[PDB]
Amino acid sequence: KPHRYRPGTVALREIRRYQKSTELLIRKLPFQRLVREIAQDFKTDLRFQSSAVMALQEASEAYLVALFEDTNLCAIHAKRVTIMPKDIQLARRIRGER
Amino acid sequence: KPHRYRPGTVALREIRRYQKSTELLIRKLPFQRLVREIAQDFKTDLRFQSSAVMALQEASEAYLVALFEDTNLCAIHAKRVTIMPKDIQLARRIRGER
Amino acid sequence: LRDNIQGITKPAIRRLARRGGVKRISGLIYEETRGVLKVFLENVIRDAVTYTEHAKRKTVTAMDVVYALKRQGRTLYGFG
Amino acid sequence: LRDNIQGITKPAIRRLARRGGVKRISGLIYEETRGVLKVFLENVIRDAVTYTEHAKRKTVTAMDVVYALKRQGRTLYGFG
Amino acid sequence: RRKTRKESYAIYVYKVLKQVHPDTGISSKAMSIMNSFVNDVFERIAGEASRLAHYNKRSTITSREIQTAVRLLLPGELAKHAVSEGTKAVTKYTS
Amino acid sequence: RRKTRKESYAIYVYKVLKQVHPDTGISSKAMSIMNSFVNDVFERIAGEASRLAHYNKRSTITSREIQTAVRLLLPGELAKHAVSEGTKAVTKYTS
Amino acid sequence: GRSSRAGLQFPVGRVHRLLRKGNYAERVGAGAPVYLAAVLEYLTAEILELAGNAARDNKKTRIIPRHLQLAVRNDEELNKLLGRVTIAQGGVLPNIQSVLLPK
Amino acid sequence: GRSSRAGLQFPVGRVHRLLRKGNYAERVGAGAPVYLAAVLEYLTAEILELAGNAARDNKKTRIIPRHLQLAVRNDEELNKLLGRVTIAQGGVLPNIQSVLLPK
DNA sequence: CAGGATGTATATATCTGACACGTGCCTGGAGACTAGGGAGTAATCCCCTTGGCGGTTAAAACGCGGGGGACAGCGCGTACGTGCGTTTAAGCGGTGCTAGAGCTGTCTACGACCAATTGAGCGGCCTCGGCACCGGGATTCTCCA
DNA sequence: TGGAGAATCCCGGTGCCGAGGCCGCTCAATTGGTCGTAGACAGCTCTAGCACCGCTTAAACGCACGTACGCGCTGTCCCCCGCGTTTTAACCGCCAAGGGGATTACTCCCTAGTCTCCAGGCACGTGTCAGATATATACATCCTG
């Protein structure tokens, strides 16, 4: 029999891995392309510094991590361990963003 | 048998009555006594205007009502209609007060 | 004065929950709500008293309460 | 450029959820997260381009992003 | 005698109200709320224009700083109609 | 030639670090974070002292305005030890 | 006067004095108080028109704080502008969740 | 100098210049840059002490942003001071909820 | 589905205080003039952003088996809603007293300002050691018999 | 409960680039007078806040009854996780233009400052009418049969 981990151990393993790391969790070029696509609807032919897209990526990943940290509390409050889009909507409308 | 309303109808009647009115829902003298008792811990023999305690009561009732709306959303999220201290604690942790 | 937090009675907390849209209320909500209100009032009255004794006054005016609320992002219109 | 919101991939949202502490993730979380990130980035990039075009520049610097974040109550340390 | 000379916004808010609703009045508590609103929006646009002038190492608040502060602070089409109203008033004023 | 004379807080933060932990150093990104932190809480204490001077119809920022701004902005025993440090420094500076 | 040179109802001179004596910059341009008074007068006219419609729908002819609160919370842009703002004696918006209504 | 007259490491004259040129008040007193430099030095010494302890606990002799983030998010007073602040390349605190652990 | 009971919206009187308007006056805004420096604009430099290319390789996409968790149904009890009667402070008005807020006047110490000087701090460069990485063993946790 | 396997931690060894210290220089901080307004302080007046008291009555409190909702349990199924395989695009190193940020020089126009005057706006009175309340009436809704 080949070895096989049970569902939830590797998830906790990568919780402990990514809560110990400091790196950026999104790839840099897709985020940079997304930033330039969003900025194309405000002013055409814009340039970005190398540190501007890094600042946007740090702020965006901190925002999304701190929103998932609240989504997880909203999921645990409903006696679940799965997060759902209604949990994200609840966290965003309790924070005062909708 | 005399008349008897079912549990939940007069609650909705009070919701429609107090979401239509603009009065202060805490009594004036207990709130003013609570304000002077809290202010005793910061400076002895203080003094309040009549308008300062009304501004404190307006802000406190607005804070508690806007917290009870979030508490109701947390209760409804867990497929309940009763609000509980776990709903208050979740609403304050998501808003960022603890 | 001692123990005026019980002046925020259970019917007053029920009226504030009714204005908040709450249909059914547990019995342990009242002590949690009294603690939350005491924490809020401590932070606001502490800032208002700091604004008051900076001015070398002995009376907490409504402007000091308005400024103490304005510096917590709970700006209050109606009192100057 | 067209449709680079799918460049925020499914394992990237899973890595951000693992850093957020999330054990199990529904399958509809990814389009919701992409919409949330797009709304956040629209608001920040709109303010950063406003700060940039006030200075009569064509380049969005890192200081424009830091100021655009600072005016949303999301102060960012490390870029000036 | 008289006490003190409070600079409120009440007569200008009353002129604006008489020009949008000629039969509607306003209470004193509502006039205090509108005065607090005008002071708050004033010191937000003025603080943001000050902050913009400080970022670009300028010493002057001009209509370009006030216009950028209005585009930063007001949401959506509020910032589209307020910039048009201010530009129209400045164009009228310099004539 | 040389570019420009960018003032920052890096050498004072490094002197403070070398008097607290004499064998621990700092990174460039950490020095940028500490510079941003010092500029941030400088702008908070100064923008609260400015408001305290404006609210009382005063035109001078004094150490009493700075002390009141420190007691308003810092939480708990930060505003006790920072007030004690600042009072000690102003006392020994006036001597 | 400068309020009537620009066509405004708001005091351009008083806004100029508050910008000069308000510790905002070392110099204040001449079109800055005109622009700021025009923006303040527009933003006053919007909330006043919505409050007057909310007063007329309540069959009243005077604006009370309830009509200002209804005006600012029944509008997405004014609620985004005034999200962190409490209006005194304003109340709340009438809103019951759909789960609390009976079958 | 004034930095060494007061017993400080932070620049009292540069803080005085930034107060005089920051559009904060019409005049700036003498003891106010001294007080503000002392408060800035205390608040730098606290975060640097906690960051040096967190750097020594990971067996390192150099502060990286991770140690600054650990220093500020563990300390209650600094976490209330820096609640709405993102530190770049700081990560998060190691924190797993109790319901997610194996039973 | 039907009718009684209860609550709430609606229409009329009536009464009050607050609001809309009128009046004096004063102080702050407008006009005119002068000086100077901030900023607008042109010109030049050189940094650093964008685009392209090619090999590596790690991450992403996709498919699949399975288990465990979400969700729905069901039952039980307890705790919360409703209502009634008793109690208790709140609210209101009326009065009195005085602390202190607010305003004015006078004086002086303190900060703005300006000019001369110099050393503190900043950019550049140079060096070496803390750390990132790599390979190998050691402990630790998980999972299935 | 224990052994196998996978994962993570630790422990030495190498290379490297970024921290840390030194050097030259320049510009901002310091020092010294001079002045003129801000504010500290004394004094005085008047508002408004605190304290008390009596009375009415509305809200709070306490209790009884019952229902409906929270919560625990069980069953089912389907969806998400772990893993292996194939693909794709990120990434890193290198190179080449060139756009535009950044700095300097210079001119000039716009705004601060001062002084003079007067009218717009504010405090204070004042009448009248919009709303608050009382009260009867009509419609809407809830609940139990």
Author numbering:
A (entry chain A), B (entry chain E): 37 to 134
C (entry chain F), D (entry chain B): 22 to 101
E (entry chain D), F (entry chain H): 26 to 120
G (entry chain C), H (entry chain G): 16 to 118
Pull text from the paper:
One of the essential histone modifications, histone H3 lysine 36 methylation (H3K36me) is deposited by the Set2 methyltransferase onto the H3 tail and is conserved from yeast to humans. Set2 is recruited by phosphorylated C-terminal domain of RNA Polymerase 2 during transcription and catalyzes H3K36 methylation over gene bodies. In this study, we present 3.8 Å cryo-EM structure of Set2 bound to the mimic of H2B ubiquitinated nucleosome core particle (NCP). Our structure shows that Set2 makes extensive interactions with H3 αN, H3 tail, H2A C-terminal tail, and stabilizes DNA in an unwrapped conformation.
To visualize the mechanism of H3K36 methylation, we assembled the complex of Set2 and the mimic of H2B ubiquitinated nucleosome, the substrate of Set2. In the electron micrographs the complex is present in various orientations and in a subset of 2D class averages an additional density was bound to the NCP. In initial 3D reconstruction, with overall resolution at 3.4 Å, a noisy density representing Set2 domain was present near the DNA entry/exit site of the nucleosome. ~14% of the initial particles contained Set2 and further focused classification improved the Set2 density yielding a map at 3.8 Å (Set2:NCP).
